[PDB]
Amino acid sequence: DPVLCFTQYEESSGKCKGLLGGGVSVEDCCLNTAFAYQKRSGGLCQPCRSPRWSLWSTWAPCSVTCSEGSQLRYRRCVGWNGQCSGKVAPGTLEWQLQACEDQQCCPEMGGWSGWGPWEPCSVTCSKGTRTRRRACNHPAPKCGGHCPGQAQESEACDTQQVCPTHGAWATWGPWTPCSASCHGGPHEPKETRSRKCSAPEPSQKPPGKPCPGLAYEQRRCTGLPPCPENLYFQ
Ligand SMILES: *[C@@H]1O[C@@H](C)[C@@H](O)[C@@H](O[C@@H]2O[C@H](CO)[C@@H](O)[C@H](O)[C@H]2O)[C@@H]1O
Ligand SMILES: *[C@@H]1O[C@@H](C)[C@@H](O)[C@@H](O[C@@H]2O[C@H](CO)[C@@H](O)[C@H](O)[C@H]2O)[C@@H]1O
Ligand SMILES: *[C@@H]1O[C@@H](C)[C@@H](O)[C@@H](O[C@@H]2O[C@H](CO)[C@@H](O)[C@H](O)[C@H]2O)[C@@H]1O
Ligand SMILES: *[C@H]1O[C@H](CO)[C@@H](O)[C@H](O)[C@@H]1O
Ligand SMILES: *[C@H]1O[C@H](CO)[C@@H](O)[C@H](O)[C@@H]1O
Ligand SMILES: *[C@H]1O[C@H](CO)[C@@H](O)[C@H](O)[C@@H]1O
Ligand SMILES: *[C@H]1O[C@H](CO)[C@@H](O)[C@H](O)[C@@H]1O
Ligand SMILES: *[C@H]1O[C@H](CO)[C@@H](O)[C@H](O)[C@@H]1O
Ligand SMILES: *[C@H]1O[C@H](CO)[C@@H](O)[C@H](O)[C@@H]1O
Ligand SMILES: *[C@H]1O[C@H](CO)[C@@H](O)[C@H](O)[C@@H]1O
Ligand SMILES: *[C@H]1O[C@H](CO)[C@@H](O)[C@H](O)[C@@H]1O
């Protein structure tokens, strides 16, 4: 039966390279054992060399991306007029099966436990948020698993309580004139300053914290001349 006669067998890919033409017998084509033949463009290029096992193909992908699996690789008997090792005809296949492990551990998600009690409201006046929480330990997840859903729920709470307004000091008033025009006399020269607790005034309705500290300041007046000695004659 005539066949397509190719001048080269690639071997790296099992392709029939360099077509010499068709309409010639297999015996004539394979006078040169370096040539090769196939039937039409259907494929399966067989070299004219004596039959010999090809190379083991690369390992197929593991049957599962999880835990232990199994992967194959093939090797084809290629040639003409004879047999490969195994009482094998040209064209047959030989397989090797191997235990593979893409990932050594398969994630199994867990289950939620009971909901924890609702925490109190996040604030004691005006409005805040209320939160309850649970654990992912019934059962606990294995590997990188995780329970389905959220581990905590939150929701708004209204305290029905007007917030108290706290007081803060207004700006400092002006300095008073000094108590004296000189230092060294009966009373040292002192300066005074005062401020109001009106920015903002506290409480309003519920009690508010009063303004912290003092509403006044005292200091010595510096830079004054010395008073004369009014106790004996100079
Ligand atoms: C390859 O990657 C892994 C991380 C998994 O997602 C594989 O899918 C499958 O996941 C389920 C869990 O629901 C396991 O029980 C399966 O055995 C695993 O094949 C994925 O194909
Ligand atoms: C809880 O009880 C209420 C009656 C208030 O006294 C709360 O104090 C206020 O809390 C708010 C917001 O958390 C602050 O802005 C106020 O300054 C503070 O007085 C209290 O926590
Ligand atoms: C204010 O101006 C000063 C320059 C002085 O003339 C002062 O007089 C002195 O005041 C002190 C007490 O602060 C008295 O002891 C002295 O008798 C007096 O000379 C002035 O008051
Ligand atoms: C397959 O197996 C071994 C190692 O891969 C070698 O004999 C040769 O590569 C064969 O094709
Ligand atoms: C399978 O085995 C190793 C890698 O696991 C390599 O020789 C090659 O990738 C083959 O397909
Ligand atoms: C936790 O959440 C719900 C039940 O509240 C379910 O999706 C499941 O039981 C999960 O473990
Ligand atoms: C928490 O929420 C409700 C009860 O409040 C139920 O779905 C279940 O008990 C969960 O643990
Ligand atoms: C919070 O909500 C109610 C009480 O307001 C109850 O179902 C339970 O105490 C939950 O933790
Ligand atoms: C006034 O006093 C101090 C600042 O000096 C603080 O307690 C606060 O700012 C108050 O209003
Ligand atoms: C009074 O004193 C100083 C200077 O003015 C500042 O701390 C602030 O203005 C306060 O009211
Ligand atoms: C008192 O001191 C000086 C005035 O000499 C100014 O910084 C300000 O008026 C303050 O109240």
Author numbering: 28 to 261
What does the paper say about this structure?
The point of convergence is the cleavage of the 186 kDa complement component 3 (C3) generating the C3b fragment (178 kDa) which becomes covalently associated with the activator surface. The C3bBb complex is the AP C3 convertase, which catalyzes further C3 cleavage. FP oligomerizes prior to secretion, and in plasma it is found in a mass distribution with roughly 25% tetramers, 50% trimers and 25% dimers.
FPc has an overall shape of an elongated closed triangle formed by the TB domain and TSR1 from one FP monomer and TSR4, TSR5, and TSR6 from the second monomer. From this triangle the N-terminal end of TSR4 extends as a short arm whereas TSR2 and TSR3 form a long extended arm. In the FPc structure, Pro255 at the C-terminal end of TSR3 and Val256 at the N-terminal end of TSR4 are separated by 136 Å reflecting that they come from two different FP monomers. The TSR6 insert folds back over TSR5 and extends with a hairpin like loop (termed the “index finger”) together with the TSR5 thumb loop at the concave face of TSR5. The numerous TSR5-TSR6 interactions support a rigid orientation between the two TSRs which is strongly bend compared to other pairs of neighboring TSRs in FP. Negatively charged sulfated groups on host glycans may form electrostatic interactions with the C-terminal end of TSR3, where two sulfate ions are firmly bound to Arg247. A simple model of the FP dimer in concordance with classic EM pictures of FP oligomers can now be constructed starting from the FPc structure.
